[PDB]
Amino acid sequence: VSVEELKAIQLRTTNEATGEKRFGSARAIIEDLTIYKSDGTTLAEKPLIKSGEEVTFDFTILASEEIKDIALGISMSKAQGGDIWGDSNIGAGSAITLRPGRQRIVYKATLPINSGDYLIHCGLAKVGDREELDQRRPMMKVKFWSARELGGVIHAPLKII
Amino acid sequence: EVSVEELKAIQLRTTNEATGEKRFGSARAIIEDLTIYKSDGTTLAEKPLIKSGEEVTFDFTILASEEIKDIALGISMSKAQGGDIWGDSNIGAGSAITLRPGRQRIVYKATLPINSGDYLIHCGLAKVGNGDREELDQRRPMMKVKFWSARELGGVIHAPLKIISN
Numbered sequence: 001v002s003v004e005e006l007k008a009i010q011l012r013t014t015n016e017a018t019g020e021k022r023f024g025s026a027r028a029i030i031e032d033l034t035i036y037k038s039d040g041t042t043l044a045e046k047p048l049i050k051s052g053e054e055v056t057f058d059f060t061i062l063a064s065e066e067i068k069d070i071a072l073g074i075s076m077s078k079a080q081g082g083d084i085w086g087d088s089n090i091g092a093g094s095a096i097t098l099r100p101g102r103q104r105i106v107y108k109a110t111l112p113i114n115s116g117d118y119l120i121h122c123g124l125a126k127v128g129d130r131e132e133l134d135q136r137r138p139m140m141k142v143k144f145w146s147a148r149e150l151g152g153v154i155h156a157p158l159k160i161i
Numbered sequence: 162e163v164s165v166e167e168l169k170a171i172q173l174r175t176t177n178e179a180t181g182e183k184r185f186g187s188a189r190a191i192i193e194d195l196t197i198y199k200s201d202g203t204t205l206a207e208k209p210l211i212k213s214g215e216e217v218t219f220d221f222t223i224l225a226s227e228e229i230k231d232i233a234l235g236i237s238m239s240k241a242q243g244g245d246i247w248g249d250s251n252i253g254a255g256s257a258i259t260l261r262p263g264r265q266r267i268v269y270k271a272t273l274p275i276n277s278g279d280y281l282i283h284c285g286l287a288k289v290g291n292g293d294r295e296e297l298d299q300r301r302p303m304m305k306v307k308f309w310s311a312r313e314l315g316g317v318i319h320a321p322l323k324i325i326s327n
């Protein structure tokens with residue numbers, strides 16, 4: 001596959017439901033992200049996440065050629081304001097080299113996030129001068145739900161002694 | 162026993178200027194003190210240093226001039242700027258509290274997945290209803306707290322990735 005084709009995909013499959021602002025050289029792209037809850041259902045099948053549960057991020061990354069030493073980042077924010085959560089393979093100490101074509105990257109995180117509506121952001125880059133390959137802001141929406149309501153975004157219910 | 166005028170005087174006297182505390186309320190009862198244990202029993206500093214994910218104990222000393230029923234004792238955290246990133250109370254926890262005259266001790270615990278950074282602690286005492294809500298002692302912010310993490314993450318949610326791909 002070629003960069004021009006990827007540039008076309010990048011511009012076409014932009015998510016307007018979230019008003020996705022997408023940019024990058026698109027030498028490789030975040031082709032798709034499927035999100036699993038701990039019961040094995042996808043967000044598509046069931047669009048909620050319970051506060052504190054194990055979430056799995058199933059990426060498909062599509063590259064026109066081999067690219068070494070890339071960073072694949074994921075983050076979440078409220079409808080407004082900066083990210084409330086974010087991390088990447090670089091932080092986690094796992095080096096990634098993209099091979100030509102379609103390939104699978106899987107992340108996990110246990111997210112103690114309070115009830116509410118959030119936005120998921122994803123970024124692909126080569127970490128020489130840094131190269132932004134494919135930034136997807138926001139890539140999709142997600143709603144969290146809890147047994148009861150807390151202040152803020154941290155899910156940490158009090159225990160009365 | 163203890164009068165409201167005395168509680169008013171303690172309220173003023175022990176306002177925390179170091180945190181620029183804004184403090185108000187009728188002071189029929191006050192949050193006389195909050196002390197924070199890392200739950201294994203030690204007392205943390207004036208500025209507690211807590212690891213992301215640790216269980217933390219909040220030990221309130223409450224002073225009441227008379228009996229007050231239907232009490233809300235809330236606690237929350239913010240960054241130096243912005244609204245609270247975390248907060249809860251006995252009301253949320255479905256635990257009723259009645260204050261008796263004089264001094265008494267109320268204890269909360271929570272396990273706080275909060276990223277490394279400097280934060281501010283707020284706490285508030287109020288009579289819930291039985292008419293109109295009465296603010297007894299609101300303390301914003303009453304002390305500082307520092308979190309540290311094994312490695313730095315974005316935002317305030319402590320939730321490091323596991324990379325399954327290898």
Ligand SMILES: [Cl-]
Pocket residue numbers: 033034035036042043044045
């Ligand atoms: Cl999905």
